[PDB]
Design a protein around this ligand. Sequence first.
Ligand SMILES: *[C@](=O)([C]([N]C(=O)[C]N1C(=O)C([N]S([C])(=O)=O)=[C]N=C1C1=[C][C]=C([N])[C]=[C]1)[C]([C])[C])C(F)(F)F
Ligand code: NA
Length: 240
Amino acid sequence: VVGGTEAQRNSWPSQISLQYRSGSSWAHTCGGTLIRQNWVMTAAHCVDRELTFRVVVGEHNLNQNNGTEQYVGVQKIVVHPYWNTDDVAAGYDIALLRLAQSVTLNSYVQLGVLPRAGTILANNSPCYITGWGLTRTNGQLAQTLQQAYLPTVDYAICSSSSYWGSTVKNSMVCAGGDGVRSGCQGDSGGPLHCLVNGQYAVHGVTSFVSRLGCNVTRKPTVFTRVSAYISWINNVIASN
Ligand SMILES: *[C@](=O)([C]([N]C(=O)[C]N1C(=O)C([N]S([C])(=O)=O)=[C]N=C1C1=[C][C]=C([N])[C]=[C]1)[C]([C])[C])C(F)(F)F
Ligand code: NA
């Protein structure tokens, strides 16, 4: 997260750290959202490889042990069938991970609230991106969870020529683009939390930013619109 501030340790309890094993160690690669005690929602481009993954819930400081973490292995990975490996621009950037064990909910670990199917937000709706991604283009990962205020940019403006044009589809949500704050490498797959009816709901899965830079003016961070996928999500969970 670029242009962000450190989050309180109990502000966003649904946020998870998706890690893969490098050698004998583990490295953070993407964010994710706890949606069931044994299911995690993230981006398809994060689990697109035959890597060994694990999820860390109740995490705040990537390097230090906070005394609140739960490390769980990933039993199965369901990528959306229409996801095309290269194409982040084509859409369908979403996947679900069945955890090998059900995690314990407490004040540092809670389930994310999903929106009602088809829900579209008004322009400039108040949302926050969270993550341990790069704090600067070509910089390094944050050690502690960062958050940044990223209001939405509705489809009409986002798909216009001065913004993302045809690259952005209706199954995506745009947020930010002020040239100061944005998502950045390592935030991928994590949540876009939006205040709706006095309640914070996860409306997006972090997908992409400008190849030319993370905080580029008029190049908002783009997310997979969760509300466009409520039926798929429920079908996967119900079926396996
Ligand atoms: C995420 O943390 C990271 N996501 C990406 O970098 C996704 N991404 C892009 O933003 C582009 N930029 S674009 C649309 O070409 O202007 C291109 N490719 C990717 C991408 C595709 C596939 C894979 N496996 C990885 C990256 C944040 C910027 C949100 C990630 F990817 F690093 F984990
Ligand atoms: Na930690």
